[PDB]
Amino acid sequence: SSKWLEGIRKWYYNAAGFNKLGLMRDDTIHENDDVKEAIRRLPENLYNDRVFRIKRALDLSMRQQILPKEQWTKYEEDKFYLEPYLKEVIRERKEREEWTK
Template identity: 60%
Template sequence: MAVKSTGRLMRWMQKVYYNQAGFNQFGLMADDTLRQTPEVIEAVRRLPADTYNQRAFRIKRALDLSLKHRILPSEQWTKFEEDVRYLKPYLEEVEREMKEKADWNAR
């Protein structure tokens, strides 16, 4: 019983943090806000064209809104439940490849 309530509490805390971060008010997803490390840059380069274009649109729209000191109407905000970690599989692959390359170079 305690595990279920702990899980619900964690989920609630995640939602609160997600909404407090504010990037969703610009229509961004969590993966759109990742710091541009070499791994992230390579993962973004590997995205399919349609996913890459959607990401670019969200970032350009967010920049435009930010410059105008505006946010999207609340019905257009990215919802916690709808935010997909689209970059995660590519990022994991890149990190695995970089680790393997470093292991080979260390020999």
């Protein structure tokens, strides 16, 4: 049911790692032409928040130390900001592919 899947998602989020290093979902994505296009289509303040969170994470991995307990950006306030832009990018990439088929 719904109580099972949300418990699994919370367990995998607490054991995922990027909650410890002060990131969100969209911070930990791998980049191709499409993902870098979606990064290029970002709003400006969200882009600056993204690069500040990335630079804090690189700092934390530099001295190999985690932020403390309460400074973890926890579950269910994670910002899915890159979702519609990258969603439309992959959709239009499939549109180009199935047009040039």
